[PDB]
Amino acid sequence: ERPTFYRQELNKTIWEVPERYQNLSPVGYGSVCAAFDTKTGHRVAVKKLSRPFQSIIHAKRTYRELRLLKHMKHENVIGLLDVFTPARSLEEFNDVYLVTHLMGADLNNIVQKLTDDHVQFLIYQILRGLKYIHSADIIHRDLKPSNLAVNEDCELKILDFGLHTDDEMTGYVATRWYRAPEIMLNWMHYNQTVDIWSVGCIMAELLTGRTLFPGTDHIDQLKLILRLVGTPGAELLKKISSESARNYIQSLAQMPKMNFANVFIGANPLAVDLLEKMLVLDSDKRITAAQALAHAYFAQYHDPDDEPVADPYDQSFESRDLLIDEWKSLTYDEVISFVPPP
Ligand SMILES: O[C@@H](c1ccccc1)[C@@H]1N(CC2CC2)[C@H]2CC[C@]1(O)CC2
Ligand SMILES: [Cl-]
Ligand SMILES: [Cl-]
Ligand SMILES: [Cl-]
Ligand SMILES: [Cl-]
Ligand SMILES: [Cl-]
Ligand SMILES: [Mg+2]
């Protein structure tokens, strides 16, 4: 049976939601409210999408977000508690609302004086969630401290999957400091190995308290990266598709890889070893999430019987060309077929 909905205007926005959601309070693409869910007892975040079907690009993006959130079922990844529309039919369908557990602090708000044990547990949880994500052939693309939610018990969830413009990535900006060089400069077709570079940048910052590659622009950032990991050899240069990018790289004086024990002074030697395996310029040679979980740095947390993989995820829609109303109808079907978690 369809629940009873109630209407209210909050901060010049109309919200029409099921009675189960009470005490709505604005907190922040879309608009977001905190609420109390009387069915589950959780405090929740409720997001009303802004203009979900205003263009082919926007309609496909709405479908993409709903498909991804419906699939993710893992302790270290954001999940979907509910999705609803007040519409009674496809003909009157206009608005989409998404519901998840309310999170209060990200990794920035946490990072305290972190012990090495704290770094072990936080990085372990990122890699456990990434093993799951990558097993479904999903690439996050935007891992950074503001996209990692952390609670009082140091438990962590990955959120805000890549679903960013040129201006957003320009200058002295945290939106670029965690990106792998091959994607920052469009060197080649990237893959899931981009996320491991980001994990290395995050782990370094938890150990030192400082951003690893805080470049003032794309070129300054590349210079900081190459000073640490070395300039590329002929093997990697062959993999860069742009002749212009290859010519630029070859204009730089050659540099050896630095000694990571003299950069990360005083850190656990096992942490230093893991950083050397994540921060490798050639993405083909980086450690994977599944391999990293078995590294000795995580010995007190690793349990191979409690590191699950995902159900298969069909992304064939990404190469499909449809009209606005066809993306809209596919989205409607996914709203009405949602089954809540236990
Ligand atoms: O996109 C928002 C969202 C809300 C409800 C369901 C699904 C997604 C997401 N929420 C997640 C809330 C759990 C904390 C926050 C505001 C913007 C943000 O992008 C990142 C932090
Ligand atoms: Cl209800
Ligand atoms: Cl509607
Ligand atoms: Cl950030
Ligand atoms: Cl040289
Ligand atoms: Cl699927
Ligand atoms: Mg974010």
From Swiss-Prot:
Which GO MF terms are attached to this record?
ATP binding; kinase activity; MAP kinase activity; mitogen-activated protein kinase p38 binding; NFAT protein binding; protein kinase activity; protein phosphatase binding; protein serine kinase activity
Positions carrying Phosphothreonine are 13, 170
Domain (Protein kinase) ranges: 21-298
> Post-translational modification, briefly?
Dually phosphorylated on Thr-170 and Tyr-172 by the MAP2Ks MAP2K3/MKK3, MAP2K4/MKK4 and MAP2K6/MKK6 in response to inflammatory cytokines, environmental stress or growth factors, which activates the enzyme. Dual phosphorylation can also be mediated by TAB1-mediated autophosphorylation. TCR engagement in T-cells also leads to Tyr-313 phosphorylation by ZAP70. Dephosphorylated and inactivated by DUPS1, DUSP10 and DUSP16. PPM1D also mediates dephosphorylation and inactivation of MAPK14. Acetylated at Lys-47 and Lys-144 by KAT2B and EP300. Acetylation at Lys-47 increases the affinity for ATP and enhances kinase activity. Lys-47 and Lys-144 are deacetylated by HDAC3.
Q: How is its activity regulated?
A: Activated by cell stresses such as DNA damage, heat shock, osmotic shock, anisomycin and sodium arsenite, as well as pro-inflammatory stimuli such as bacterial lipopolysaccharide (LPS) and interleukin-1. Activation occurs through dual phosphorylation of Thr-170 and Tyr-172 by either of two dual specificity kinases, MAP2K3/MKK3 or MAP2K6/MKK6, and potentially also MAP2K4/MKK4, as well as by TAB1-mediated autophosphorylation.
Where's the motif TXY? 170-172
GO CC, one annotated term: nucleoplasm
Q: Which residues carry the post-translational modification N6-acetyllysine, per the record?
A: 47, 144
Q: What is the active site of this protein?
A: 160 (proton acceptor)
**Residues binding ATP, per UniProt:** 27-32, 47
Family of the protein in this entry? Belongs to the protein kinase superfamily. CMGC Ser/Thr protein kinase family. MAP kinase subfamily.
Q: How does it assemble?
A: Component of a signaling complex containing at least AKAP13, PKN1, MAPK14, ZAK and MAP2K3. Within this complex, AKAP13 interacts directly with PKN1, which in turn recruits MAPK14, MAP2K3 and ZAK. Binds to a kinase interaction motif within the protein tyrosine phosphatase, PTPRR. This interaction retains MAPK14 in the cytoplasm and prevents nuclear accumulation. Interacts with SPAG9 and GADD45A. Interacts with CDC25B, CDC25C, DUSP1, DUSP10, DUSP16, NP60, SUPT20H and TAB1. Interacts with casein kinase II subunits CSNK2A1 and CSNK2B. Interacts with PPM1D.
Output this protein's name. Mitogen-activated protein kinase 14
| Species this protein is from | Mus musculus
Q: Which gene encodes it?
A: Mapk14
